[PDB]
């Protein structure tokens, strides 16, 4: 992996140079970016933490489904609506 | 049914195209389309918009002559309006009469 | 004119002034503008006239001293505000967005977030209703609202 | 032969050569090419109006997409003017 770090002009280091752990020091603060663990296609319960539907009390095939996705007047679904997908 | 109404629409659109091209050439000579048309009529040249566009495209010097004539007629009209008296009518403002 | 000097000693002194240009074209006029034939022939650009009528620091001069009739005074006042906002008076300053024909003070107008329907459209004022009656020199009157 | 161009009927290779030969044989200074008009130049669709002058007197003008082809077209225009087989010439009398 190659990553691009934004530096000021006084921080330029010659290309080809080795970087080690001691570039940081104890008692410091950093930010760490990485690809999170992929979960594949996931439903709203895992992807967005919806409450779902109750198990018993007559429910037909719905325990883990999104409820209404939009309102009646909107003849469409808003962009950015929380729907199942890759997580 | 459209081949029948498109006849009318074709006539109208061709006239609009002529007007647009005439306006383009007139503005090229610094004149405006209403001024050009009205003053040509006043000068008693009855060229229609089709041939005016044809001259603007294919006969640029003749079109510049026409624009000059219309501009002169407009200036003569301004002069007569400001004079408001009984000064000589103007060389190109003269009307040839028929009986 | 007259100046006051402070040094404690405060004193008043008279300085040289301009007088009236020799021969007005209309001596019978009752107001400087009426006397020079300018009733409807000056705009916010005519900073020469406006400067003749303003204070050194951008303020207006009172009617009882300028000799102007209310109508002309108010038109001068409006033209002066418009010229100040346009920046045509760089030296009559107190104590970046290019504007002109600015009627209202820039810091006191709210944006038109909701333009109305095209039959009750909220328009944007331009120019001045006081200068509405200026000479047109055109076949279309001034558009005071955009 | 009604409605065709001289160099559409009679093909030639070097109009500049023919033109300088004609000018030399009728005792005229050799033409100088100059850039009368120019539009674009850095783009892929330029327009160059190159004029041929003789003794600082314009004898011809020609358009093109490149300076060289515009100059060649100006040479052809000059040839047409000199030989009289021009577009606005007096049409044939039948």
């Amino acid at each position: 992996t190659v990553k691009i770090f934004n530096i000021t002009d006084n921080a330029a280091i010659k290309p080809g140079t080795p970087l080690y752990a001691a570039h940081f020091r104890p008692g410091q603060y950093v930010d760490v970016t990485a690809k999170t663990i992929g979960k594949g296609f996931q439903g709203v319960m895992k992807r967005w933490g919806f409450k779902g539907q109750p198990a018993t009390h007559g429910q037909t095939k719905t325990h883990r489904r999104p409820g209404a996705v939009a309102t009646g007047d909107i003849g469409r679904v808003w962009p950015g609506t929380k729907m199942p997908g890759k997580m | 049914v459209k081949c029948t109404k498109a006849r009318y629409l074709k006539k109208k659109n061709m006239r609009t195209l002529w007007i647009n091209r005439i306006t383009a050439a007139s503005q090229e000579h610094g004149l405006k389309y209403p001024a050009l048309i009205g003053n040509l009529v006043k000068c008693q040249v009855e060229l229609n918009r089709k041939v005016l566009a044809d001259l603007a495209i294919y006969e640029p010097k003749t079109f510049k002559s026409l624009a000059a004539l219309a501009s002169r007629r407009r200036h003569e009209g301004f002069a007569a309006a400001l004079g408001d008296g009984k000064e000589p009518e103007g060389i190109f403002s003269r009307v040839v009469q028929y009986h | 004119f007259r100046e006051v000097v402070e040094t404690t000693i405060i004193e008043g002194r008279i300085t040289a002034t301009p007088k009236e240009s020799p021969n007005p074209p209309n001596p019978s006029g009752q107001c400087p503008i009426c006397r020079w034939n300018l009733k409807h022939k000056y705009n916010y650009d005519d900073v020469l006239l406006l400067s003749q009528f303003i204070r050194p620091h951008g303020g207006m001069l009172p009617r009882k001293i300028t000799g102007l009739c209310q109508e002309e005074h108010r038109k001068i006042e409006e033209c002066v505000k418009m010229a100040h906002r346009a920046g045509l008076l760089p030296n009559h300053r107190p104590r970046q967005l290019n504007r002109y024909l600015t009627r209202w003070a820039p810091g006191s107008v709210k944006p038109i977030y909701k333009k109305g329907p095209r039959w009750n459209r909220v328009r944007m004022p331009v120019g001045s209703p006081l200068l509405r009656d200026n000479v047109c020199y055109s076949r279309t009157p001034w558009k005071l609202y955009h | 032969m009604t409605g065709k161009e001289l160099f559409e009927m009679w093909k030639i290779i070097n109009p500049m050569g023919l033109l300088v030969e004609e000018l030399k044989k009728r005792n005229v200074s050799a033409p100088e090419s100059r850039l009368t008009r120019q539009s674009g130049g850095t783009t892929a669709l330029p327009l160059y109006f190159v004029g041929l002058y003789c003794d600082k007197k314009l004898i011809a003008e020609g358009p093109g997409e490149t300076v060289l082809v515009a100059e060649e077209e100006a040479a052809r225009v000059a040839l047409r003017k000199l030989y009289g087989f021009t577009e606005n010439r007096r049409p044939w009398n039948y």
Partner: protein, 97 residues
């Protein structure tokens, strides 16, 4: 000293009226560009000068963006068309003058 239009871009227009006043005569000789107004025409030791024939193959995207930059258009003109339109095109169009 009066000219209806500026007299320096297309032709030297001179308007006239005949004596009877029935017709207008326009004299318009062309205006020629001054020579002064023109501009002059712009202007491995051991081996062959091998001809520099490189043609990098650009994939469709960057290719189309290069063409669009070159000709100041959008990408839609450059994207292709289907067999229906390709066959509907007239390959022997009428040609006047």
């Amino acid at each position: 000293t009066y000219s209806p239009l500026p007299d320096d871009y297309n032709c030297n227009v001179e308007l006239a009226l005949t004596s009877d006043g029935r017709t207008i005569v326009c004299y318009h000789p062309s205006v020629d560009i001054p020579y002064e107004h023109t501009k002059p025409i712009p202007r491995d030791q051991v081996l062959k000068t091998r001809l520099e024939e490189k043609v990098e193959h650009l994939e469709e995207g960057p290719m189309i963006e290069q063409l669009s930059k070159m000709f100041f258009t959008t990408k839609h003109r450059w994207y292709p068309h289907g067999r229906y339109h390709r066959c509907r095109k007239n390959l022997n169009p009428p040609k006047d003058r």
